[PDB]
Each structure stands twice: as structure tokens, then as C-alpha cells.
Point group: D2
Chain length 268, copies 4
Amino acid sequence: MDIKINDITLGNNSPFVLFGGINVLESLDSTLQTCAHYVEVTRKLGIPYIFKASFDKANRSSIHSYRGVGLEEGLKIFEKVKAEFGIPVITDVHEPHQCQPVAEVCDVIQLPARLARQTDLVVAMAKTGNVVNIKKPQFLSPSQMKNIVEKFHEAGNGKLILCERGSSFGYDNLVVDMLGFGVMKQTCGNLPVIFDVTHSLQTRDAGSAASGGRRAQALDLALAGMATRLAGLFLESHPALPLHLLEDFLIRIKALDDLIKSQPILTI
Amino acid sequence: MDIKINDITLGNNSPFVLFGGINVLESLDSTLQTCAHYVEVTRKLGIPYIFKASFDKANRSSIHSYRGVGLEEGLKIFEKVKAEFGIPVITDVHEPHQCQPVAEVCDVIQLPARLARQTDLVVAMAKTGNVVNIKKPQFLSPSQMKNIVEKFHEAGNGKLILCERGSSFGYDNLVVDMLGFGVMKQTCGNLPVIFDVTHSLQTRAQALDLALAGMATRLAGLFLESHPALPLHLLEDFLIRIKALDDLIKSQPIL
Amino acid sequence: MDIKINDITLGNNSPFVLFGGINVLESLDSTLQTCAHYVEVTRKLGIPYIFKASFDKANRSSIHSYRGVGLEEGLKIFEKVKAEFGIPVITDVHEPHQCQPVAEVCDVIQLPARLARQTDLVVAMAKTGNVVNIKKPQFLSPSQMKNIVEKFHEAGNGKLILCERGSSFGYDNLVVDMLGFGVMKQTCGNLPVIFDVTHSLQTRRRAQALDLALAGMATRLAGLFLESHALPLHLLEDFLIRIKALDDLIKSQPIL
Amino acid sequence: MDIKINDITLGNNSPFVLFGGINVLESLDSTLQTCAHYVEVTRKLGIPYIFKASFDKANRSSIHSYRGVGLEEGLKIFEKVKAEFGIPVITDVHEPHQCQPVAEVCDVIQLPARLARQTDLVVAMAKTGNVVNIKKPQFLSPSQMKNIVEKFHEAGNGKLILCERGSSFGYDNLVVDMLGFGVMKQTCGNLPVIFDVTHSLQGRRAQALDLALAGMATRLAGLFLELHLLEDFLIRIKALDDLIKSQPIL
Ligand SMILES: [Cl-]
Ligand SMILES: [Cl-]
Ligand SMILES: [Cl-]
Ligand SMILES: [Cl-]
Ligand SMILES: [Cl-]
Ligand SMILES: [Cl-]
Ligand code: NA
């Protein structure tokens, strides 16, 4: 099943879409500057791009870390991003009451992994009728995603993206099961699957030392996921991977994606 | 560090405290019946007791599933439990705005495991000044519980209980690392550690074996659910065993 | 099901049996001294005791680490232990050809975890007719132990002990699933289940070994398997006092 | 570091090599038939090929299960495969005494994962001087492969292949950590790394293809694989391998 996002077609048989941006919105000027870097690199390669940021992030690593400019100013920033660059945008919500006003502006709304079973939020997000990105909790098996999808369907919204972010592996933070992508596609009606490679490399479960040198293998992880035929890649980059590297990185991802997406799926 | 909850002393070198009750509040009358059973059993066995129930199941599998009586009616039920039996109670909170009104009634308020990183919720719970029960996420290493404890300390509340509920073990399965208890005690200032045996068994006579094993490591409390979950009529027999072990362990000097 | 090992009764409802000793037989005099310390302490506390050591350790940290005294001299050392102290002994085997000569001397023979699905070794061990200790591999689940037990039964030997040593948990780490003991008892005919606390900790000390040991023994087990040099040898008495306390309590109550 | 196996170059920047065949050798005729199929498919696609089989099934579910032809007859069959098809072969060894006679015939000898810490087996395999395929244990972090490599080096054999076969994930289940390939390359001197997709897989056809594609995207020396399913698979794997190998390393 494909999802149309303005001009973009998002789907597991379509050219991959890049989701990226900044962690939290600070100001119009800082946002436009960072967005412009992604837009310039993606335009150089012809890759569809959706800008991501949080306006009120409730799960930062300290309780006084800045949560973002907030709903009213955040939406004004997102409006300007859409107008200036002509791209769609994506943000997370965590309060049911925020869903409707966010959905007036933001093309895709995101269901934080920790909240993925929270019924009042699921309903409120569903009722917006917007595209929704469902983050797969690290503690949920891929064959359980169908239950979250079922709740969205019960609440009347089928425009759903499934977002892989890794699975809990010992006290070693996260491992990504490359088979989980296929399990999701098969059980959830071939909804668009996207791969959050950045959060798959998170180390808040066990601390950074428990991940050893393994996180340096991030291009590899991205390539490996995209080899399984995916609608998109969710990826953070700042001058997260560095920006001199972003073009080189996307060249490799686009090469693989183009190769994969050009071949018919295996005969049956 | 010990925590006083009314007349109860909760701590890792004190007689274990039972946090027991039910999944979800469904009516006044069923709640009082179940709680009466727990009170009568625990009083005769001499086991300190805190009554547990959720007022809302916020993450059931269908949007049409029964969620329980809800906040307003749930607090009325908890007020009646406290009046009738004179015991403390515990319930979970899911939204920052629920924290102050829940804390006015419920002695202990509980941070759900999946919400343990929600900073707005941590702050709102902390501000209540109530005793807090921190459910350890299945995806968190025991040496990282300190990170949650640090947030509560920064928010000005140190009356914290650490609650084991198992660790993810592959897909759809949990294991309880019996060494984690000691890791939590050493790295979190010997705050009370309690064991949620019920949720640790998320896919028998297995509950007793697992409870015994956890309590062998010397813990402040046991957290469990029954249904009229352990069959309610087996409660007394179950607790006799747990108390026999707890008494023995607690009588041995710490090494 | 109980197993008699000389005058010892091993079983999940009997007083726990300590299986203790050392990693690798490296000498005669030092072996006897260490064994003597275990004997003195277990006799003082009334705890049944079986001395454990490897004669050939195929597991070493370097290619030229000493592998141990070997079969012939190792069996001689075991003979001396048995003559001097009058206790049973246990050791591991790695090759079918070693089964007979080791079984003639040793009261229990051990199947290494890595070899637990090696059919030729299983058959050769079964055919000795000796008591066998089956080490549960860290990569095998507790409900698969019944398949190893079946192979021994097909080969004619039912005098089997199941030994827990933890399960793989992420990378380079072990966790002991306290529920596995019950799964093994239920699916394998209530054969004796013992807990190798030493090897269950090898990726993680004294206070840890105690907590883990107590936790396991709370589940009602036939025995505890440990190495010293590994627990410091002088702390053996204190450690066993606490284990025996819990074991006596548990074992004195009927099963629920 | 590349390894030459006859006229095959095996390395992490070379065209991938297919290791495949059958589980356990049962007869000459069925072995030659299966091998001929792999040869015909790999030749027409231009993929280097090494034939794999065990002479013995060391783990069977019953004591009375069929065990395979055994060492003596197994080596006679491997000799005939090499004479008929002119390809290298690979088999596993389980006992030190088997190492020298197997190495006389088999180009690559394999260290089973469960036996990777058996020091006497390592030494005996090293002393053959043959190319060795080291199967990574399901509990070991990829950085710990360096400790096994060190042992082989100290025993005088540097012709080593590291082989991924998945990692234990709870009970009775495996996961392949796609980050581990790079870790093994970086910590073990860029020895060839190959991916045992068959044993990593605790329809199922489509799963094997997804997993194989994902691992080969990390840039590997080779792969193990068990109406024309082999060729359809290989066509896709070769397409991806060729693309990956044509990009400079980042
Ligand atoms: Cl903080
Ligand atoms: Cl998560
Ligand atoms: Cl709960
Ligand atoms: Cl959890
Ligand atoms: Cl041992
Ligand atoms: Cl093992
Ligand atoms: Na004997």
C-alpha cells in the first residue's frame, strides 16, 4: 500500500524517502539553516525529503533539557519550512489534545514508541486523518505491530507508516532484525516500512560502553536495511552522522535503493 | 535507605512488604471483597500490606476493551479502602495532570515502565512529594536505573522504590536477572527494591518458585496480583512460604 | 527421581549436595590440600560432598596454557582423593575413548555443554552405566534438555543429572532463568537438577555468587556446583552456612 | 587480506564466493548430482563456487538416525567431486585426529561454532596449513573473534575466514547483527568474512533472500546458501554484490 504525501509517493516499491532534521525546534532561523542543508543535499541527488523536528519533546535525557519552542511557535516554524522549501514535514505528538492543531500543519504525525499502545493518543491521532508514523517499540516483536495497526483501523485511519528502531538485545542496547521488516510487511498489509537507523544506534538502555565499537558501522546498517526493500530511511545529520559525509552516505543508499527497487519482487 | 509509609517501614533489611491486589478497579464491592481477603490474610501472618489496583488500563489491545472505572470513580474507591481498612494504597499514573489529584488520595504513586523516560510525568510525580514506585523497564539494564533515580532527585523527591519486572529476552519473553537486584541496591543508594513477580511472568507453580528466588536476594517487598495473576484462595499458602524464606534471609547478617 | 552416589542420595527433595573443587588438576599435593579444606568444612556442617576437577581442560585462554595433568595421572590423583577422603568424585570427558577408563574411577562423569548434542559421546557415556552430569548449553533452552535425556535413555542409561550454567544474554553475557529449573524438572521426569553458579557468573564477586546461589536453591534443587581457587577457598564455610540454611528451610516444607 | 583458493580470490573487496552444497554426504551419485546443479548455475552467472558437505552428522535427534557416509567414504566422495568438477571443497571437522587426513583432500576445513574454544582442535586445524573457516559462536560479540584469530596465528596459520551464523536471541531463536561484519573486519585484520545465511535462519524462501541481501550489503567475501530458486536468488545477490564492490570504501 502506498501513501501519497503531497507530491511524494511513499511505499515499499517506490524510491526511498529520506526523513531527517533536528532534534528539537529552537527558532525559525536555526531551523531553516539546518533544513536547507538537507534540502540542498537531497536535491543534488533527486531524493524525496521530509523534514523532522520536535516542537515539544517529552523524553529527553534530562528533565531540564530544552523541550522545544512549543506548539504555537513550532507550528509557525513548520509553516515557514513548508512554504520556503515546498517539502512535507513530520513531528511527534504525545498529548491527545495536541493532535488536531498539529495536523492542520504537519503532513505526518508521529506516535512515540513508548506510547504506541496508549489508547487515548492512538484514537486522537487517528481522528486527525493525517498520515501517521508508528514507531516500533524496542520491546515489541515485529508480529505485534499488527495490533497497533488494528487500533488505528478501529479508530478510522489506514494511512500508516511502520518505523523500525531496533530491538532490545541483552543489556547491549539494540540489535536490528533484518527479518522483522518482512514480518511487518506480511502481517500489516504491506504498509510503508521505514528504518530509523539513528535510533537503532541509541545507548540509553545499557550506556554507551555496552555498544563497544559497533555504532561506527552505521552506513552498513542503513545499507543492510534498505537491501530488504523499504519505503524510507530516518536519519539525523549535523556538521548523528556529519554533513560532509551526508552526500556520500546518500549516494550509497540511493545506489542500492535504485538497484533493489528496479527489480521485481521474487517469483511465486 | 528505608521509607516510612504510614506505620510501615519499607527497606531492604526490613520484613518484606506485600504490594498486592488486582489488575484494574471494576466496582466498589468487588474491590472491598478482594482487599478484605488480602487484609485478613496479611494481618494474621503479620505481613505489612499495601493494596494495589489500576483505575484505568490505558494500553489494552482494542479501543473498545473495558478500561476499568476511571480516575474519578477510582479515587472514590481508594478513599473507601483506606477508610475501611486503614492501609496504604498504590496506583499507577499515566498523565502529568493526574498526579496531584491521585496523590491526594493514594499513598504510593507508580511510574509505568513504558513511561519511565517521560520527563513531564517524572516532574509531575516528583512534585507531589508522595512515595513513588519506579517500574524498571524490561529494556533497561539494572546499572541504568540510576538514571531514572537521578531525574527524580533533580525534581526534588528521594522517596523512591525500585521495582523489578523482568528483562526482555528475545521476542515476546522475559527473564529475571537475579543479579540485578544487588546492582540496583549498589548503584542507587540502597533504596528499597521490590519484585513484581506477576508481570515478570508475561509469557503456574512458577510464580512461587520465581518469587522465592527473588526474595532470596534480600528485598524490601513483593508485588503481586490475584484474581477471584495468582488464584486468590492460594494467597495464604503462597505467603506462608514467602514469609518463611524472608524471615530466614532477613535473620542472616549481611555479608 | 533420586540417584544414589555411594552413600549420598541426590535428588530435588533431598539435602543439597555440593559438587566442588577446582578448575584443572595441576598437581597432587595442592589438590589434596584443597580437597581437604572442602572435606573439613562439609563434614563440619553435615553437607554431602563430591570433589570436582578436570584432568584435561580443552577450554583454555591460550593454546599453550597448561591443559592439566591428563588422563592417566588425573585418574591416579582421583584415586588418591577417594582413598584418602572416602568421597565421590566427578570429572568431565571430551572423547568417546575416554569414557571407560574415566568411568572406572570417577563416580560421576560429565558431558561438557559444547558436546551435549554429540551423539557418539552421548552413546559412549550412556554405555558406561555410570551416573552422568549433563551440562545445559548456554544456547539451549530448558525444554530442549528432554531431547538429550531421551538419547541417553535410548542408549540405556537413566542415571542422569541436569546442570544449569546460565543462558546467553546479548553478547558475552549470561543470565540464569530461575524458571528453567522447573521446566527441566517437569519435562525430564524430575531427574536431579544442580546449579553451576561458578560458570553462571563467568561473565560478570563473592556477594554475587551468594545472591545467585541462594536464588537458585530457593527453587528446590538437588545440588550446587562450584569452583574455588571462582570463590575464595577460606570463605567456603560462611558461604555454605547460608546455603544450607536456605536449603534446609525449603526442603523441610512440602512442595506447593 | 585476500586468500587464494586455487584460481579463486576470496576477499572482502573481491566478487563474492558462493559456498554451498548439502547437509550430509549420503552417496556418491546424489552428491555429484547436487554439485553439478550448483556448478551449472554458478558458471552461467559467473560466480566462484566452493562445494560444501559434512561427512558426518555429529548431532542427530535419535541414536538410530542416519549419520552420513563417514570420514573414509566421505573423503573418497570429495576426491571425485574435485576430479570431476575442478572446484575446491569445504567440510567441517570435529576431532583433532580427523584434521590431517581431511586436509589432505579438502581445500577448506571448518571449525564448528560450538567447538571454537576447543584449543586442541584449533591447534590441529592450524597445523594442517589449510585455509580454515572459523564459524562464530552464537554467544560471542563480533570483537571477540580476534581472540580465536590470535590462537590460530600463534599456532602458525593465518589463512583464516570468519563466518557469521547469527547470535542467540532469547530461547530457540537467532538474530544477525549487521553491525558485526564491520567489527570483525576492523578488529581481525580484514580477513575474509562470509555469511552462513542457512544456519542463521533458525515464505521462508523470501526470508533467506532478504537476509542474504542485507548481509551482502555490508561488503563481504562470500555467502553460504542451500522452480529455479538457486539461480533466482543468485542473480539478485550478484547484482547487489557487484554494485557494492564497485563503490569505494567509506
Ligand atoms: Cl535530570
Ligand atoms: Cl522503544
Ligand atoms: Cl502494575
Ligand atoms: Cl517494560
Ligand atoms: Cl565444569
Ligand atoms: Cl555453553
Ligand atoms: Na564410576
